Design a protein around this ligand. Structure first.
Ligand SMILES: CCCCCCCCCCCCCCCCCC(=O)OC[C@H](COP(=O)([O-])OCC(O)COP(=O)([O-])OC[C@@H](COC(=O)CCCCCCCCCCCCCCCCC)OC(=O)CCCCCCCCCCCCCCCCC)OC(=O)CCCCCCCCCCCCCCCCC
Ligand SMILES: CCCCCCCCCCCCCCCCCC(=O)OC[C@H](COP(=O)([O-])OCC(O)COP(=O)([O-])OC[C@@H](COC(=O)CCCCCCCCCCCCCCCCC)OC(=O)CCCCCCCCCCCCCCCCC)OC(=O)CCCCCCCCCCCCCCCCC
Ligand SMILES: CCCCCCCCCCCCCCCCCC(=O)OC[C@H](COP(=O)([O-])OCC(O)COP(=O)([O-])OC[C@@H](COC(=O)CCCCCCCCCCCCCCCCC)OC(=O)CCCCCCCCCCCCCCCCC)OC(=O)CCCCCCCCCCCCCCCCC
Ligand SMILES: CCCCCCCCCCCCCCCCCC(=O)OC[C@H](COP(=O)([O-])OCC(O)COP(=O)([O-])OC[C@@H](COC(=O)CCCCCCCCCCCCCCCCC)OC(=O)CCCCCCCCCCCCCCCCC)OC(=O)CCCCCCCCCCCCCCCCC
Ligand code: HAS
Ligand code: HAS
Ligand SMILES: CCCCCCCCCCCCCCCCCC(=O)OC[C@H](COP(=O)(O)OCCN)OC(=O)CCCCCCCCCCCCCCCCC
Ligand SMILES: CCCCCCCCCCCCCCCCCC(=O)OC[C@H](COP(=O)(O)OCCN)OC(=O)CCCCCCCCCCCCCCCCC
Ligand SMILES: [Ca+2]
Ligand SMILES: [Cu+2]
Lengths: 102, 143, 57, 63, 576, 135, 216
């Protein structure tokens, strides 16, 4: 397999998205992206519940809709976030190990 | 092909989430502008769509795990790393147009529902696909 | 011993197979003419005999 | 400018003329004919304006 | 980074010949038999513009008959046939094939491949699309005529019991064949991106047109099988006496759900590639990079995900879909579609804009499409769509929006890549005449339709009463419709004339600041695209190739943050 | 490298039609005119018939108009002059293009005379190249 | 395995009866089609008259006479009266190929118009449209056919010269170190010092176009 880092002289700065340490290939990141997109549906759910309540309907279930909305939103947000961070770990240690960010 | 294989898990997770959400919602929620009950078209459609993206993501990942570090998947590749053979490509072929004509005859037979047209169109289609797939292998004439 | 086709490439046995369903040693399609071949060849060894045709004028 | 203004003059005479005719015809089939005259009038109006819009800042030289 | 030797006896490779110098017999048998992706692309584009003229002629007949209250020359049946076939031709024989034609031409030039993955499958896609067109239009040759149930083919109106003519069958097989063409094209493009990129052309160095073609290939592969399945179910029902779409089987809404699960992703399949063409054009004439490149990729893939969950906002007034779910989903997919405008403004922000024809067409696209999308979010809200569904307001929405993408940005692509395609430029003045005619005619046609739709006119109405109050609006709209129809006369003349007598291109990049890789090769490219390849390091390699003194500057200015890693130490050691 | 020069055979150039020697190539222009105008006359003669509808007549007269304008532009042979303009960053004819890929690979030509900072920005340590260009 | 003339289903002959699709056999359909496409051009000369179906017989006779006299008008217009024993490939003689094809289109349109009512019944075209397709198409169809055929002839011709100049396209695409993609050709004859073939002359015969034809 190819080495961990490649030859950069001083003064050279790359465009380095597909590098081996970039979170755009580490699989955790894209799952976290999926879950972060998915979390917004729970915000939609709680808003639908509260809006239906405010005009006097959905009265037998709007508290349950609010509960499932907020818990779905928060668990998707949380596990998607931590998955993003687990994808972005190698780049962070790269940024520590050398002065290079780009 | 790492990023390509991995970015198929965004839509997979999303479409699976929307499938389960849509299913539970259409069976349990009630509003005055629809009748309660699980909506089967959108259910099957979303789960099979997540199946398609799952299929591509999993096959491409299972391939990626045993392909070498290619120059086109490398940030500082030299242009001379892909020097050599790239592969075989068809230079010319009359049989694509032939196949379109076979499918046209079949489709017009289906339109009018003439049985002989359907038979002849299916015969033409198997013939033209076969001749397409035998193009670069036909023997030299032995006389 | 098991059979191998005479047109089949020889290979390093540690390197698996010439081709398998997931992977190949080429980026496009393998050629019908055997990838072990190197083209072009001499016209003498293609066997094409170019005719000499004269028609009455 | 040149032909710009020329077009803008001609097209107006066409457009007004069609507007005079679409009131005379008035819902028959020839109303369509009137509209076509009006459209051609508007086309030549815009044609003149387009010429102006090109010679305001040409992107090509006659070389 | 290695450096070559200044080799002896070196002279640049020979330039291919431009168009218009052809001897007789040079393209007949080649057309019939070629597997060259770029001749196939030219054929796609010519074919789709011919169908554009057909469908638009149908539309202008519609506008002529709506000019005054009575039925002046059309019947009710013929008016129904006309709007049905106008819709079908413009969406499935102009739109999708021009998408795949532009893809076929420029995509292997953008990623650095010689061919596409499956050349004969590419040829098959072209020919099956042409046969689908011929089949679909053959219905007009019957005595009864074409299909007349709207391009949506709603059931039970599409059952044999309610639409028995043969044209109703021909329409089905037509759309089926066109879908077969699309899936062939989609397979090709996807494999070609996965398997034939150039050295150093990693995924996050491809241009944005390539990324959009990626995601729309995925969408097309999802949806076109489903339309073929549903429509072969309809043809099964009609021919064999089946009952799947029977009304007592819930068949009406079975059809509507299936159709729109195909059909909204299809409008995104038509929108995204032309957003990509505009994202190619805007940075070239601003002399500025494309702003927010990775963010644009994420927005594109976000649309690709969301498009499969927003489908049933075409069914709000059916009283049979869960309203808040699809309303919220539509409100979400509005967000990444709108982020594209912010990125284009960032690409123009304090640039050095020059107004050649493609920049004019692209900014006209932006102005046109903004209003269409603003109109769209009103339909996303069911309280408003209760009044607006199947009104002329909807006509105005999707015409603003489908002209914004598939017409304005299609002409932008034509002007932008005509030099590369042919080796010749087009006449800039005739292009500006085309643009202003199209612009004036278009806004004069479809802006006033918002009002007449809000006022109570439904779509698909052959005839109306002079008491409705609709007459004056229809009259204004039809006058500007004929103007918009005249707009194609300078366009056809410009293409024809410039193809054989146009100004010759002497440079690899006649606009000067070409970002993508297609401007690193000649005009026109050789048979296998590249006589030599440059170093790919940015996402705009051609710019780095032609202006090396800028390669230090852009890397310093790329980010707003105070990144200091141009003073970082050496990394690695030696090998490469 | 080598190319054979063309030859004419009964008025047909081998550059235009390769096998001009082997058979009958190109029937001439006056026969095209004769055939087309006889066919126009027949297309006009069909209007004299016992038929009652004029859909037929519109078809006949449109196809006659197409035939006539076709034969007219065949007779008079229109041509236009090549456009003599310069648009955008296109250069006049006769300008010679450099091979930028070779110039980049070798650090010569258009990539000649790069500052040391510009050489570092492309990952060329200037020590290597100063020995070999601009020494 | 297939009927051809169920005479029992037709019944004996009666001058008063007739059927819808009462066509003749296929080799005669062209004559019937001629009878259908000819307009009602009849001459009334005092006490006499020349029926419209006279011009049918004139037209058919002309076609027949033209067919029997083709070698002689080809001698007039090619200027060749030599003694031949080697055939021509049809691509190498485009005028004759295009004339023959447009005559085949003429004959096929007369045949299809001779059975046009069966066409209309089975594909649901207007029968009036079918006779008008016969009339207008016996002009425009042969012209279109001549043009299409001529250009395809020259294209096949030119495709042969491509391979006698540069050799067979192998389909193998090979990348050079400078980045160039080059397709490997296989020369059919000797080669120049720079690898470019020495172009062979066209010999009237078939030139192979793929490696499998050489036997690889
Ligand atoms: C088989 C028939 C046959 O043998 O025909 C050969 C013969 C070509 O002549 P040839 O002797 O073989 O080669 C010499 C040519 O001069 C060599 O070709 P060329 O020099 O004519 O150039 C190709 C040709 C163009 O190519 C062709 O004509 C062939 C490819 C298209 C054919 C398939 C689609 C046709 C439409 C179908 C609709 C149903 O260029 C033009 O005609 C001028 C440019 C295009 C304007 C004219 C078309 C108007 C409608 C489209 C508007 C497009 C808007 C701009 C889009 C951007 C364009 C870059 O005729 C055709 O190819 C006709 C095509 C069918 C119409
Ligand atoms: C429904 C059934 C469809 C047909 C069978 C299933 C197709 C896939 C089979 C496996 C496969 O991928 O083989 C590729 C593979 C080609 O490999 P290769 O020769 O190494 O090609 C490498 C080149 O680079 C290849 O590059 P190339 O571009 O030069 O060659 C293109 C070539 C090969 O393309 C590929 O290998 C790549 C793409 C995969 C193939 C399919 C592409 C998409 C086909 C058209 C669009 C979708 C059609 C959907 C139709 C169903 C609708 C419900 O495409 C084909 O041969 C596909 C068949 C054409 C179908 C046209 C639609 C009708 O096939 C073979 O070698 C096996 C030979 C036999 C395969 C075809 C057998 C057809 C028999 C059924 C005919 C239909 C009548 C059914 C009647 C039923 C009773 C009444
Ligand atoms: C001025 O000097 O004029 C006389 C001029 C003097 O001749 P010249 O001095 O020898 O050379 C004159 C040029 O150099 C002429 O030079 P060129 O060589 O360019 O022109 C020669 C042209 C000169 O001739 C012409 O120009 C012909 C006249 C124009 C054509 C008329 C077409 C009219 C179309 C209307 C449609 C009619 C029917 C529709 C029914 C309507 C009412 C119901 O003749 C031909 O091209 C010969 C064509 C022979 C036709 C027969 C081919 C049939 C092939 C069949 C294949 C057989 C096997 C399969 C068949 C299927 C069965 C399985 O031309 C003539 O003498 C002939 C004029 C007639
Ligand atoms: C065709 C047969 C063929 O090519 O077979 C290959 C091969 C050639 O034989 P080979 O063993 O290579 O022998 C050496 C040849 O001498 C090799 O000599 P070659 O390469 O010169 O032979 C090919 C030759 C062979 O060409 C012929 O013999 C022509 C025969 C076809 C007659 C025309 C088509 C009928 C259309 C009727 C529509 C009504 O074709 C040409 O040279 C030029 C193209 C001819 C056909 C062009 C298409 C017609 C376009 C017109 C369409 C009409 C549009 C308007 C419709 C009306 C509107 C109202 O033939 C077969 O083995 C096929 C047997 C039959 C299956
Ligand atoms: C190229 C083709 C098309 C595109 C793209 C497109 C985009 C949209 N459409 Fe659509 N459309 C609908 C909604 C939208 C929405 C929300 C968007 C969005 O993509 C629009 C987003 C785009 C923008 C350009 C937004 C503004 C941009 C910016 C940058 C500002 C930021 C945005 C904010 C703050 C949100 C806006 C908020 C405001 C308060 C204004 C709905 C329902 O919500 C229906 C069904 C209604 C019915 O059945 O009557 C519909 C119907 C159609 C049909 C019907 C055909 C038929 O006969 O049935 C077609 C062909 C079509 C095409 C296309 N449409 N559309
Ligand atoms: C990409 C997709 C589409 C494009 C582009 C498009 C373009 C137009 N549309 Fe549309 N369409 C309508 C009007 C127009 C007009 C006026 C144009 C224009 O772009 C058309 C002009 C374009 C041309 C390309 C014309 C070429 C002109 C020629 C060939 C003649 C020029 C020569 C002249 C004028 C003579 C010269 C005279 C001199 C004086 C020189 C209307 C209403 O005015 C409706 C609703 C009808 C109803 O009743 O609901 C409609 C319905 C639809 C539907 C729904 C179909 C259904 O409900 O079943 C779809 C999907 C659709 C798509 C598309 N449509 N359209
Ligand atoms: C299917 C789901 C589709 C995606 C939906 C949105 C979620 C994606 C964006 C946020 C979540 C992902 C975290 C980012 C991971 C990542 O790539 O890091 C940022 C990267 C910076 O690159 P670098 O500095 O090298 O460090 C990382 C190593 N490459 O990247 C950057 O440079 C970041 C630049 C900032 C803006 C990024 C994205 C903007 C999103 C635009 C619209 C998204 C539309 C979604 C619907 C609303
Ligand atoms: C293997 C066998 C395949 C070939 C069979 C050919 C015979 C065609 C046939 O079956 O004719 C009868 C058929 C009746 O239809 P059928 O398929 O039985 O289905 C029920 C109808 N929905 O009839 C049809 O469906 C339509 C057949 C009519 C064909 C056209 C007739 C008018 C024009 C013909 C001109 C003369 C023939 C020219 C052909 C040669 C040209 C060189
Ligand atoms: Ca009216
Ligand atoms: Cu939608």
């Amino acid at each position: 397999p190819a080495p961990e880092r490649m030859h950069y002289i001083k003064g050279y700065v790359p465009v380095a998205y597909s590098s081996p340490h970039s979170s755009l290939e580490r699989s955790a990141t894209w799952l976290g992206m999926g879950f972060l997109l998915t979390a917004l549906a729970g915000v939609g759910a709680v808003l639908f519940a509260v809006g239906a309540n405010s005009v006097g309907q959905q009265q037998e279930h709007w508290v349950l809709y609010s509960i499932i909305g907020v818990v779905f939103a928060v668990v998707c947000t949380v596990l998607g976030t931590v998955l993003i961070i687990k994808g972005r770990a190698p780049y962070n240690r790269y940024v520590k190990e050398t002065g290079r960010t780009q | 092909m790492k990023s390509s294989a991995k970015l198929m898990y965004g839509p997979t997770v999303f479409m699976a989430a929307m499938a389960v959400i849509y299913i539970f919602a259409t069976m349990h929620v009630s509003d005055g502008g629809s009748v309660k009950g699980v909506e089967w078209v959108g259910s099957v459609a979303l789960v099979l769509s997540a199946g398609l993206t799952l299929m591509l993501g999993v096959y491409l990942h299972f391939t990626e795990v045993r392909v070498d570090v290619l120059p086109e998947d490398w940030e500082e590749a030299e242009v001379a790393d892909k020097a050599g053979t790239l592969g075989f490509f068809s230079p010319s072929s009359i049989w694509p147009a032939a196949m379109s004509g076979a499918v046209g005859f079949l489709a017009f037979g289906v339109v009018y529902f003439h049985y002989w047209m359907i038979a002849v169109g299916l015969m033409l289609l198997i013939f033209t696909i076969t001749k397409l797939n035998l193009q670069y292998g036909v023997p030299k004439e032995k006389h | 011993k098991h059979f191998v086709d005479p047109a089949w490439p020889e290979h390093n046995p540690a390197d698996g197979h010439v081709v398998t369903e997931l992977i190949s040693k080429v980026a496009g399609a393998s050629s019908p003419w055997g990838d072990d071949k190197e083209f072009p060849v001499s016209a003498e060894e293609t066997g094409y005999v170019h005719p000499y045709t004269r028609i009455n004028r | 400018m040149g032909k710009s203004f020329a077009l803008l003059v001609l097209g107006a005479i066409i457009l007004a003329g069609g507007v005079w005719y679409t009131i005379e015809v008035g819902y028959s089939v020839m109303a369509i004919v009137a509209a076509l005259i009006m459209a051609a009038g508007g086309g030549i109006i815009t044609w003149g304006l387009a010429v102006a819009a090109d010679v305001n800042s040409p992107t090509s030289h006659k070389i | 980074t290695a450096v070559a030797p200044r080799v002896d006896g070196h002279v640049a490779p020979q330039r291919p010949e431009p168009t218009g110098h052809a001897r007789k017999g040079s393209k007949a048998w080649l057309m019939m038999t070629t597997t060259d992706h770029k001749q196939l692309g030219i054929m796609y584009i010519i074919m789709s513009f011919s169908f554009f003229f057909l469908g638009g002629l149908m539309a202008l007949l519609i506008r002529a008959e709506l000019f005054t209250p009575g039925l002046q020359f059309l019947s009710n049946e013929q008016f129904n046939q006309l709007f049905t076939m106008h819709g079908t031709v413009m969406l499935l024989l102009y739109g999708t094939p021009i998408v795949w034609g532009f893809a076929n031409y420029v995509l292997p030039l953008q990623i650095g491949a010689p061919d596409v993955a499956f050349p004969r499958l590419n040829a098959f896609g072209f020919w099956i699309t042409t046969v689908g067109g011929v089949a679909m239009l053959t219905g007009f040759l019957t005595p009864g005529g074409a299909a007349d149930f709207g391009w949506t083919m709603y059931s039970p109106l599409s059952d044999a019991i309610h639409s028995p003519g043969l044209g109703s069958d021909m329409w089905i097989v037509g759309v089926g064949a066109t879908g077969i063409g699309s899936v062939a094209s989609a397979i090709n493009m996807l494999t070609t991106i996965l398997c034939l990129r150039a050295p150093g052309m990693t995924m996050f160095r491809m241009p944005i047109f390539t990324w959009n073609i990626f995601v729309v290939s995925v969408l097309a592969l999802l949806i076109f099988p489903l339309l073929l399945a549903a429509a072969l179910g309809v043809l099964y029902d009609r021919k064999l006496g089946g009952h799947l779409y029977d009304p007592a089987n819930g068949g009406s809404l079975l059809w509507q759900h299936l159709f729109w699960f195909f059909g909204h992703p299809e409008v995104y399949v038509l929108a995204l590639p032309f957003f990509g063409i505009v994202s190619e054009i805007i940075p070239v004439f601003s002399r500025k990079p494309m702003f927010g490149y990775v963010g644009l990729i994420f927005a594109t893939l976000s649309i690709g995900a969301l498009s499969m969950a927003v489908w049933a906002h075409h069914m709000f007034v059916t009283g049979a879909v869960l309203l808040p779910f699809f309303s919220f989903m539509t409100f979400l997919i509005s967000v990444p579609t709108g982020v594209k405008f912010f990125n284009w403004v960032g690409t123009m922000w304090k640039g050095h804009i020059t107004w050649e024809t493609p920049m004019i067409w692209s900014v006209g696209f932006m102005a046109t499409f903004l209003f269409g999308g603003l109109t769209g979010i009103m339909l996303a809200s069911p309280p408003l769509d209760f009044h607006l569904a199947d009104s002329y307001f909807l006509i105005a929405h999707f015409h603003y929006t489908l002209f914004g993408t598939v017409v304005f940005a299609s002409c932008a692509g034509v002007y932008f890549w005509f030099p590369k395609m042919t080796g010749r430029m087009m006449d800039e003045r005739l292009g500006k005449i085309h643009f202003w005619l199209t612009f004036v005619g278009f806004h004069g046609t479809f802006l006033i339709q918002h009002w007449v739709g809000n006022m109570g006119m439904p779509r698909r109405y052959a005839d109306y009463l002079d008491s409705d109050g609709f007459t004056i609006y229809n009259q204004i709209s039809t006058v500007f419709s004929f103007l918009l129809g005249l707009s194609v006369i300078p366009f056809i003349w410009n293409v024809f004339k410039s193809w054989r007598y146009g100004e010759l291109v002497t440079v690899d990049d006649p606009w000067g600041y070409g970002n993508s890789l297609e401007w690193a090769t000649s005009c026109p490219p050789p048979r296998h695209n590249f006589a030599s390849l440059p170093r790919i390091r940015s996402e705009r390699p051609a710019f780095e190739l032609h202006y090396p003194h800028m390669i230090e500057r852009m890397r310093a200015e790329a980010h707003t943050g105070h990144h200091d890693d141009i003073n970082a130490p050496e990394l690695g050691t030696a090998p490469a | 490298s080598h190319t054979i020069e063309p030859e004419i055979y009964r008025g047909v150039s081998t550059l235009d039609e390769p096998s001009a020697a082997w058979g009958w190539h190109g029937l001439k222009r006056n026969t095209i005119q004769l055939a087309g105008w006889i066919s126009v006359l027949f297309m006009l003669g069909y209007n004299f018939g016992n038929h009652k509808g004029h859909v037929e007549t519109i078809w006949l007269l449109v196809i006659t108009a197409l035939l006539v304008i076709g034969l007219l532009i065949h007779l008079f042979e229109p041509k236009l002059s090549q456009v003599r303009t310069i648009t955008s960053r296109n250069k006049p004819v006769g300008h010679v293009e450099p091979d930028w890929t070779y110039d980049q690979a070798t650090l010569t030509g258009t990539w000649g005379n790069l500052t040391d900072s510009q050489l570092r920005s492309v990952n060329i340590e200037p020590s290597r190249v100063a020995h070999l260009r601009a020494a | 395995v297939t009927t051809i003339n169920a005479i029992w289903n037709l019944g004996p002959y009666n001058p008063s009866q007739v059927s819808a699709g009462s066509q003749p056999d296929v080799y005669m359909l062209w004559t019937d089609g001629a009878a259908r496409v000819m307009p009602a051009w009849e001459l009334y000369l005092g006490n006499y008259t020349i029926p419209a179906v006279f011009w049918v017989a004139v037209m058919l006779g002309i076609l027949v006479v033209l067919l029997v006299t083709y070698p002689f008008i080809e001698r007039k217009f090619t200027g060749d009266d030599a003694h031949h024993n080697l055939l021509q490939r049809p691509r190498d003689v485009p005028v004759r190929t295009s004339l023959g094809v447009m005559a085949l289109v003429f004959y096929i349109l007369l045949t299809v118009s001779g059975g046009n009512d069966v066409y209309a019944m089975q594909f649901h075209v207007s029968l009036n449209a079918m006779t008008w397709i016969g009339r207008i198409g016996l002009i425009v169809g042969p012209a279109i056919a001549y043009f299409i055929t001529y250009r395809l002839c020259i294209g096949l011709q030119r495709s042969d010269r491509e391979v006698l100049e540069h050799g067979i396209e192998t389909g193998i695409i090979k990348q050079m170190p400078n980045g160039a993609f080059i397709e490997v050709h296989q020369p059919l004859g000797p080669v120049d010092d720079h690898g470019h073939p020495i172009p062979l002359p066209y010999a009237g015969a078939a030139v192979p176009k793929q490696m499998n034809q050489l036997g690889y």
